[PDB]
Structures are given as C-alpha cells and as structure tokens.
Write a protein that binds this DNA or RNA. Structure first.
Lengths: 129, 55, 88, 100, 271
RNA sequence: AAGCUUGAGUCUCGUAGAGGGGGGUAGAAUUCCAGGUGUAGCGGUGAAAUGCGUAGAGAUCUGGAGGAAUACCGGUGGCGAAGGCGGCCCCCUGGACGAAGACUGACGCUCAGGUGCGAAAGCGUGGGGAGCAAACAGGAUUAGAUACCCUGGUAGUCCACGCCGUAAACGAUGUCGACUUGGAGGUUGUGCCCUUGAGGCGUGGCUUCCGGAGCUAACGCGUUAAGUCGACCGCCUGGGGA
RNA sequence: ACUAUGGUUUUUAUU
RNA sequence: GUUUAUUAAAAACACAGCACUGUGCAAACACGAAAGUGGACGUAUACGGUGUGACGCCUGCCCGGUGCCGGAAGGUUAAU
C-alpha cells in the first residue's frame, strides 16, 4: 500500500528534473520545508514556496545546468527498513566534496560539512551530488 | 427490447434463414444487440420466428 | 446481495446518526448480516468454491476489523459481541 | 414485486379442455390466496417450426405477479399436463393490462 | 444417510449401514399384521422347492393396499416408517373419515401431506390418476397392469418407471431393466419415485448377519459327488465340463421365459 | 498522552458482464431400430483389403430414441485470482465500476509453515456410455511395422461423490503501492451541452497501438513499464552423471 | 504446386 | 464358524464380498403328468442358478473343440 511520504517527494524531484518540469508540488510537512531550505542554499533547487494552511502543499522550482538537472544523484539510504546514524567524524564523504550528506540533528537540519564544523552528528536523511 | 408479441420490428435484425445479423451492420452496437438477441431467442422457442434452417 | 431494507436496519440499531455507516460497529454488524445472508446459499454442501472465496474475504474483513477494534478499545469490542452472536 | 409472464401453448383440439382448467393453471396462486394480472388467450397461431408433430396451436398467458417460492409449483403445473406442448416463464418484466 | 460402522471385533471398520432418521422408530399399525409363518423353502409335502432360504428371525407381515380400494377419497400421510417385509419403506395413510391403510411410499420424507386420487385433484406426485390424463416422459411410480388389479413393478428402494409413448386406449412403459411394453390407459399411476433409494449402499458385515435374514449355506455343487449335485466331478479343481443347475442344465446365459400370454404387449426386452 | 487527515473503506442514488453453485428442459447432428419407393453397389486410397452388400446395403421419403456436444448473435466485446467461463430456462450467490454528499480514521500492506482452489490423464465406487478412442485384433503399408494408413474395439471421455495439485501455468516477468512527456482508437459510468449528434467537453474504471525519459547482449518493456523509488517473502549459483 | 514411403556414408595434418 | 458320529477338524467346507448369468410377476424354478404348495404374497436397490473368496497392485495370447445369445436368408430335413 502507500508506504512513504518522502519517496512521493523525491520521485517528483528526480523524475520531474528528468522530464524538464518547471516547478513540482506535493503535501507539506515540517521536515519537507526543513530540507528545502538546505537544498536551496546548496544550489540543488532554484526556489521553494508553500501553498495553504489546512491541507498544506509545497512547490519546488527545479534547477538546471548545461541542458540537464543540477543534480547527478539524490539517494535515500536512510529508509523505513534501515535508518542510518552518523557520528561527528563517522560522517561519510559524498563524492570527494562534490556532494553533501544531510543530517537531521538535535540542533537543526544541516549538511555533514556544517555537522563537522559543529562537532555534531545524528540521523541521515539523504546523500546528494 | 425483450418481448415476443411483435415480430414486425424484429424482422429487420434477421435474415431469411432466421439468423441474427451482426451489430456492425445494423448500427445496434453490442449493448442493444444483446437485448434484441433475447427478444429473438424467446420468439424462437415460442415458434414465432424460425430457429433452424435447411432449405 | 443483501435484502434492500436490511442495511438501514443496522443504522436503525448500531448507528447514532441518520443514514451513517462510518462506525466500525455498524460495519461489523452489517458484515455479520451479510455473512448470515450468504450462509443461506451454504449450510449444506461445498460446491460453490468461488462464492466461498468472497465469504472468506468478508469473514477475514470482520476478523481484520475486530483485530483493529481490540487494539482500539476493549469495552467497544466486548459491547459489540454483546449485541451480535460472536464467541457464542 | 416478483413477476413472471407464464406463457403456454396447447394442442388445438384440446382447446375445449382449457376452460375446465381455468382455475387449475392458477392453482399455485389461488393456494397462496392471490390472483393473477391476466389469464387470457393470445389466439390460435401457426408455428414457425412444428412442435410434437403439431403445426397450429393455441396460446395463453397469465402474468402472475406472484412470489418465487411458488415458481416450482408453476413448474409442476405443466409437468404432468396433457393439454400443453410448451410453457415459458419470462422473469421480471412487470405486468400491465391491454395489448396482451 | 448413509454412514460407516466401527469395529468391535476384527473386522467391521469399513462396513456401511443405511440409517434414515426421518422415519418413525415406533410401532406398526396392528389391524394390518399377519403371522406369515416361514416354510424353509419347503412346500406342502416336500422336500426343498427353493434352496438357501431357511431360518428367521420371526417376523409379522404388514398388509399393504396395492389394489387402492375406493376412489377419490381425501387422505393424509400420518406416518412414514421402515418395513422389513420389503425395502422401499412404507407410508401410513389416513382417509378423511378415520380409515387407516398401509400404502407404498413416496420419495418424500415430510409427513402431514394431503393426498387424493383424481384428475381435478392437485397435479403433485402422490395423487393417483389414470394414465389417459398424463403426458409423455412422465415418471409414474408403482402401477397396475390391468385396471383395478393393483400395484406391481418398481416397488424396490428408489425404483421407478417412465411412460415413453401414449396412443388411443393404451400407454407404453419403459422399464429400468431394459424392457418396453404397453398397458391400458385406464390403469392407475401415482407419479414420481419410490422411497428409501439408499439400500444398495449397504454392505452387511460378517457372515452371521445373513443368518437372521432368512439365509442358510449350501455346499458348492462343484465340491461334492455327481450322485448328489450334477456339477460334482472326481478330484475337483478341474471340471472339464460346462457349469450347471442342480438338474444338469446350463447356468450361464440360457434364457427361460415361456409365458406366451403377456408377450404381444411388449416392444423391447432385457438383454 | 491527545488532537488532524491526505491513506483505506462503507453508505445514499446508480453501472456492467459467457464469474460460480442448485434444480429444470430444447435446438440439431452422428447413429441405429422399423415400413413405403428402389437396385448392385458402398466404404478406403498412391492402390487397397478387412468390413458393409440380394440376409435388399448405399440413396430417398417417413416414424422413433439414447447420449455427448451446443451455429448465427460473437466484436479492438466481457467475467473470474489462477485452473477456468459462450445451449436456454428458473432459483441462489461471489468479486468489480461512477457522480456528488457524508462518516469513521491508519481500520492499510506483506508473509516460512498451514489452508482453500486442479485442464487433461490416472485412481476409489456405482450408474451411464449414441459418438471419439489410449490396450488391442483384423486388414494394408514396409526391409520390418508391435507405429503412421483403413475397419472395428476395451479402458477413459459424461454424472454424483472422494483422491491426485501437475504444465510451453503465457499478459512467461512475486504481492501491495507511489512517480513521469505527448497523441489517437475501443468500452462503459457520471457530470454538463434543446444531446432535439453513437456525438461533443470535462472526468473515473477497464482496454489497445505508437512513444519522450530510463532500462536491456539483443529482441523488447515504456503510465495495465522490464523505468525511478518505499514495505514484505520466495527461487538461483557451469554442462553431464541426475 | 503434393508422387505412396525409406535408413546410412571411417579418420587426419595451413602450422 | 463347518466336517468323514467310531483312525483325517485340514491347506477341504462355509462367508460378508467379487464376478458371470436367469427372471416383467399367472417371474424364473421345484415335487407331482395334475391336485396344490413353496419362491412370495416379495417385484429388478427383488428373487433364482453357478463360480470365485479380505485387501492391495495388476491382469498377455486363442473362436479349432464344447455350450449359450443374437442374426435371419439359404442348406440337410419330419408329419403332411
């Protein structure tokens, strides 16, 4: 049956940027707007904006580079059948610094770069390059 | 749509041999054809329309 | 297939709002009446294995609703089998 | 309500025996305290193909407006009858006056 | 039913018994019972005249109305019960003014059913009428071969007869044995099938259980000497001759009908 | 610990079908029994013979029956999960589909073992048994012919009930569910258009053919994906021996 | 277009 | 379970069952030429004759002989 709210968001991004879509939309949540604010300033999306307040929605403007998507791989890894936790140096190196790992933390959603700079760790959300 | 008490309306959807004419010919389409087939098959068993043909 | 007035007989007893069936107690009472109406075709011999698959599906639906109800509230379970012939 | 047309075909020379059965073909419904909508003839007709070596027969219909728990008695009603050659039931269809 | 047995001595576990819980287990209607003393297969002055019949248990005979005396009288089926003189079970019929008779049973097991003879009588099976008033293909139950003579043929458990033609004054029967013959349309038919129908599913169990069913042994003719039974031959286990009756006549395939009275009414016969 | 609902479902009013089961009974054609008319052939084939033929066949006309199987309609037309379902009738009954309104609220998915489900053949057991025919005989073919060919013919094929779970199981591809560019056709609901048009414009379910992105030795899949993701469970590990 | 039909041809040398 | 009572108690005999077959009821058939009676006052799921002998798994060849059933034309052939 319907199993995961984040696969329903990542498929719209991944398949929408493969199908040259301008901006893609899904149901909102606290987590979904937290990762949008990372993916924005790390340059993986061109804009994010919410719509509504009762049954709320989120719209992401996709970002392109040289006639393809700005993203080369966005991978889950941390999934309902296997969650991944990473400590302050135990954090992996995504594509030798050409990509990021996204961490939830007790202190705010951030990159593994910002987590190393804070001596911090937590649960993984995704790996992006 | 179902009754045997008029054959003058049913004659249009049959042959001289009493065979049922396919819906692609008569503009009936499959749904109404399957109704006319019931009126005809009832009128057949009441001996109001020919069933079998040999000559 | 169920008798045309028999769905409203569940609303007239296990229901608490007009024409409403959202209650799991109405669903289990309706499924129990539907199982009883389908036992009219059985209660003799095993020949119709196809219509028996739909019987097992509604018997499983009643079991799956009762598992959810036992996980919800034990009194709402116990008071349902007090108005229906379960655990006889 | 449950409906059945109950149409039957009789041997032409036994058409004189049918008025002696005008309460017998309905005996399944009279035994249920009911009354049929029609019980009327549809005239004498020639057959499109011969049945039990007859070529012309007499037609009658009842329109019983009666329940499905006496439809088995309406089967026995013709099972041991010598005057018929065929009967047919035609379930539902409703029942109306005039035009047979 | 029918149902399996259970072993009390080796062996019975696979034996089957009929069992009919819809029949009344009570007492037969006494004004219809006769002593009917056994004769041991021996006639008035004999000596044996039918072999293997011998022994009891003691049994009274129940008088059945196969002749169906009086006509058109309303009745009801008051009891259905078993009868050991026969195999199709019996019906106890009660006429409207208190007259009780034993009559040959229907296929039905529901009691209180109201039954009468006639042609303006309800068309149902069990209401007896003359074969001049019925259509072809009908199953007739037990019938009379001459008007008013009474019921013969198809009296055994679940047996019946079918009428397969009619013309003028006469009707043609098809028999389940492979026979086809005419009778007069003034003869009475009760319609449908006779009671029990399960008797052929039974398998008795143990040799002794026949000894109270009117059975005694008799030694194989092939196992004794030719002074005694003509099938006997010196040293045995290799006869060199055809098998025979106790009178030295053929016992496989030889036809024996010689009636010459009833045969001109017959169309087809048993193989 | 407590709210919320989008997930899933039902209800009001409606939509469609060879889905299954119980009980009836009807439209013809093999074939055989019986009579009229009638005469020496019929059947097979590269040829034939066994076989049927004056014991009057075949052909024709007619009277009649058991039992198996059900033309047309019938289709890019449907149902079932799969085996499977297309004489017709009467009774009974499974699952699926839509609009809008509403209620309940995670009630949803999957699953070693286990359970239910079996085309045909075979088997338990009785009944049936026209026809088709594994065994096989007789004939013929041939090097041979225990096979292919011709004439028969037992089991079996039909029914009730019980066993046996098998497959080039086929839409070959586990079950459930998300996601993605475009076109045209078929079917059928619903809402709308005097429908005053089997037709349109929205919009669902089913279905059919390209095809964008992706995948694949290669064919091919492509919104009913073999693509990209979320949950669960089986099966595999060079040929032969096996 | 389709006769009515037939089974079987020792092994080995371009490095 | 039965048996040569008094030299044989058995592997023979008997049996649910299994098979082959007769029989349409004034049944087949018995004893009697018949008179009757039994079968049976039962009725093809009933009765008669015979063989075979739990069950399981299976079960090739033969119509020259001997008896039966059907086919019915013709032949040998009686009284007449």
């Amino acid at each position: 049956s319907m199993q995961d709210p984040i696969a329903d968001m990542l498929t719209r991004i991944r398949n929408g940027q493969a199908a040259n879509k301008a901006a893609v939309t899904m149901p909102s949540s606290k987590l979904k707007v937290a990762i949008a604010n990372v993916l924005k300033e790390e340059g993986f999306i061109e804009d994010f904006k919410v719509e509504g307040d009762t049954k709320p929605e989120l719209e992401l403007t996709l970002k392109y580079f040289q006639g393809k998507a700005v993203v080369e791989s966005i991978q889950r890894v941390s999934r309902p059948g296997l969650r991944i936790y990473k400590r302050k140096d135990e954090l992996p190196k995504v594509m030798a610094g050409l990509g990021i790992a996204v961490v939830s933390t007790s202190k705010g959603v951030m990159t593994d770069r910002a987590a190393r700079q804070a001596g911090l760790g937590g649960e993984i959300i995704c790996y992006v390059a | 749509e179902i009754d045997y008490k008029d054959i003058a309306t049913l004659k249009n959807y049959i042959t001289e041999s009493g065979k049922i004419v396919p819906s692609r010919i008569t503009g009936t389409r499959a749904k109404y054809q399957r109704q006319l087939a019931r009126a005809i098959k009832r009128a057949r068993y009441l001996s109001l329309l020919p069933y079998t043909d040999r000559h | 297939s169920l008798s045309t007035e028999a769905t409203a007989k569940i609303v007239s007893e296990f229901g608490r709002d007009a024409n409403d069936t959202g209650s799991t107690e109405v669903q289990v009472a309706l499924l129990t009446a539907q199982i009883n109406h389908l036992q009219g075709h059985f209660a003799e011999h095993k020949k119709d294995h196809h219509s028996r698959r739909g019987l097992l599906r509604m018997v499983s639906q009643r079991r799956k609703l009762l598992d959810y109800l036992k996980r919800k509230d034990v009194a709402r379970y116990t008071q349902l089998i007090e108005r229906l012939g379960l655990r006889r | 309500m449950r409906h059945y047309e109950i149409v039957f075909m009789v041997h032409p020379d036994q058409s004189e025996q049918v008025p002696g059965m005008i309460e017998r073909y309905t005996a399944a419904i009279t035994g249920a305290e009911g009354k049929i909508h029609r019980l009327e003839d549809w005239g004498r007709r020639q057959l499109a193909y011969p049945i039990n070596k007859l070529h012309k027969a007499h037609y009658v219909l009842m329109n019983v407006e009666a329940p499905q728990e006496v439809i088995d008695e309406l089967e026995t009603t013709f099972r041991f009858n010598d005057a018929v050659i065929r009967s047919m039931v035609m379930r539902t269809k409703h029942a109306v006056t005039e035009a047979s | 039913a029918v149902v399996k047995c259970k072993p009390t001595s080796p062996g019975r576990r696979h034996v089957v018994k009929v069992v009919n819980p819809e029949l009344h287990k009570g007492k037969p209607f006494a004004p219809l019972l006769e002593k009917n003393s056994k004769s041991g297969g021996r006639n008035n002055n004999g000596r044996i005249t039918t072999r293997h019949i011998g022994g009891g248990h003691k049994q009274a005979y129940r008088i059945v109305d196969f002749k169906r005396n009086k006509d058109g009288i309303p009745a009801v089926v008051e009891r259905l019960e078993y009868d050991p003189n026969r195999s199709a079970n019996i019906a106890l019929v009660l006429y409207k003014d208190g007259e009780r008779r034993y009559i040959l049973a229907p296929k039905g097991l529901k009691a209180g059913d109201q039954i009468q003879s006639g042609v303006d009588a309800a068309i149902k099976p069990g209401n007896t009428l003359p074969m001049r008033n019925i259509p072809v293909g009908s199953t007739v139950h037990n019938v009379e071969m001459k008007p008013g003579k009474g019921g013969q043929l198809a009296r055994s458990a679940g047996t019946y007869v079918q009428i397969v033609a009619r013309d003028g004054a006469y009707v043609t029967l098809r028999l389940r044995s492979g026979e086809m013959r005419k009778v007069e349309a003034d003869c009475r038919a009760t319609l449908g099938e006779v009671g029990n129908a399960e008797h052929m599913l039974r398998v008795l169990g143990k040799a002794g259980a026949a000894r109270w069913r009117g059975v005694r042994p008799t030694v194989r003719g092939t196992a004794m000497n030719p002074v005694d039974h003509p099938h006997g031959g010196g040293e045995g286990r290799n006869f060199g001759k055809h098998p025979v009756t106790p009178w030295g006549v053929q016992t496989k395939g030889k036809k024996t009908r010689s009636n010459k009275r009833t045969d001109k009414f017959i169309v087809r016969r048993r193989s």
